[PDB]
């Protein structure tokens, strides 16, 4: 049950670094279409 917390949190971190990248990959084109107007 200790390692299940570690095995769960590691794929959580894989979600964490992936979501932080693609939300920025959302963001960089998100404000990009603002200045297109």
């Amino acid at each position: 049950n200790h390692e299940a917390a570690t095995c769960l949190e590691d794929v959580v971190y894989r979600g964490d670094m992936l979501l932080e990248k693609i939300q920025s990959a959302l963001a960089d084109i998100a404000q990009s279409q603002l200045k297109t107007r």
Binding site: M17, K21, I22, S24, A25, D28, I29, S32, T36
Partner: protein, 44 residues
Amino acid sequence: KLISTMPGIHLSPEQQQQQLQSLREQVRTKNELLQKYKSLCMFE
């Protein structure tokens, strides 16, 4: 000549000269956003 009116001063020729650059800038900024979307490596 009336047939040749719908090419002419409907949009002024000087204004045509200005909006030629507007269309060229539209094409260029469309291309610019296209290679800005394609160029960045969003993957780590």
